[PDB]
Amino acid sequence: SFVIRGDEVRQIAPGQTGKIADYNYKLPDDFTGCVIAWNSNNLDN
């Protein structure tokens, strides 16, 4: 668990590409799991 900008949420998948998927948090190609995300704007920061 972590926080990101709203546009980055689309990168959290097996085989995705982008700055977060390259340099911060990457899944394996055979991932077995769930990805959950929400617009926590009230954290703003």
Add this chain to the structure above:
Amino acid sequence: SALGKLQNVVNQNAQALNTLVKQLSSNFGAISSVLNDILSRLDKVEAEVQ
């Protein structure tokens, strides 16, 4: 023309091997029949389907 029985063995062997190599050029519905195109043009989750 007498040796047609033996010449047919040579022709059938050649015809079958040429057909097996020709079939490398076919797409089979993939975006290209050249494997390095697919690997260089697509991200892995798309490339594996092709």
